[PDB]
Design a binder for this molecule. Structure first.
Ligand SMILES: NC(=O)c1ccc(C(=O)Nc2cc(C3CC3)[nH]n2)cc1
Length: 289
């Protein structure tokens, strides 16, 4: 770590602090994340998982019981970009380009059987060129998803798939498609889709919009560990009310990304072929750094 000069603190992650820093040997500006043998091997497998829409893991440094991850640095995250674009909204062509690139990132990781498990706007990073990249891919399998961060901050439930909330222990790549669907809806409407503040509030917000799931829409739901027959039965809402002014192609794609049954939920690869992307382009965002 004597090879890095900290520039500034860029945030507090789930596992530890994130700094912007300079590598003295190469002159490289990086993001430094300050975090057991099983974690070392898993994190080392991530150094190989390279794609233009995945924040590059440059190095893993393990010294004096501390783990440091050295990543490619990007100048802004999607959460801050969405807040900065609150008054006007992010233009639809830019939302579509970001969704398309995020799906490419997911299709790549999922093809290598690597799940993210904790996608959220905070871990989507953007640059001046119009790229968007997924950060922290693979970290949840290495260290777990805790209730609170190292600073006691509450880990957000807003993008959590219903099978995780219902106690499925062996979840699939579909959990990342659900989280990305929630993010897509939030970019369009400028409001979080399901801003739960407890596990039951998160689940009941999903049920109030998509309908309480049953054996018809989700075979096996009633046998899930945390399912309770006493859950209230709410009716499903039309997407036309949920995500206006999203067009019919976008609403149909979103509906497939939010299917209750993870087996029915669209894959990233199939989502890339959706008619919503017929006119996709790569616009340049308005970024003042
Ligand atoms: N708006 C701003 O000043 C702003 C917001 C976010 C960032 C940011 O998190 N950057 C990062 C993080 C990373 C890898 C995952 C560790 N690479 N790059 C930097 C600057």
């Amino acid at each position: 770590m004597e090879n890095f000069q900290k520039v500034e603190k860029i945030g507090e992650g789930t596992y530890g602090v994130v700094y912007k820093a300079r590598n003295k040997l190469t002159g490289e500006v990086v993001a430094l994340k300050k975090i057991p043998s099983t974690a070392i091997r898993e994190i080392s497998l991530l150094k190989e998982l390279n794609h233009p829409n995945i924040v590059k893991l440059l190095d893993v440094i393990h010294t004096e019981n501390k783990l440091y991850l050295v990543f490619e640095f990007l100048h802004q995250d999607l959460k801050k970009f969405m807040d900065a674009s609150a008054l006007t909204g992010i233009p639809l062509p830019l939302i579509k380009s970001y969704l398309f690139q995020l799906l490419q990132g997911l299709a790549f990781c999922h093809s290598h059987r690597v799940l993210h498990r904790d996608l959220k706007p905070q871990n989507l990073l953007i640059n001046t060129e119009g790229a968007i990249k997924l950060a922290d891919f693979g970290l949840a399998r290495a260290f777990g998803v805790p209730v609170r961060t190292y600073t006691h901050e509450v880990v957000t439930l807003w993008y959590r798939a219903p099978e995780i909330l219902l106690g499925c222990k062996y979840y699939s790549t579909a959990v990342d498609i659900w989280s990305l669907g929630c993010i897509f809806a939030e970019m369009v409407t400028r409001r979080a889709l399901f801003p739960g503040d407890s596990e039951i509030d998160q689940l009941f917000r999903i049920f109030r919009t998509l309908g309480t799931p049953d054996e018809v829409v989700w075979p096996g739901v009633t046998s899930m560990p945390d399912y309770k027959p006493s859950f209230p039965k709410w009716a499903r809402q039309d997407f036309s009310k949920v995500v206006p002014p999203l067009d019919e192609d976008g609403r149909s794609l979103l509906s497939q990304m939010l299917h209750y049954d993870p087996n029915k939920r669209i894959s990233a690869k199939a989502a890339l072929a959706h008619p919503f992307f017929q006119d996709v382009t790569k616009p340049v965002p308005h970024l003042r750094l």
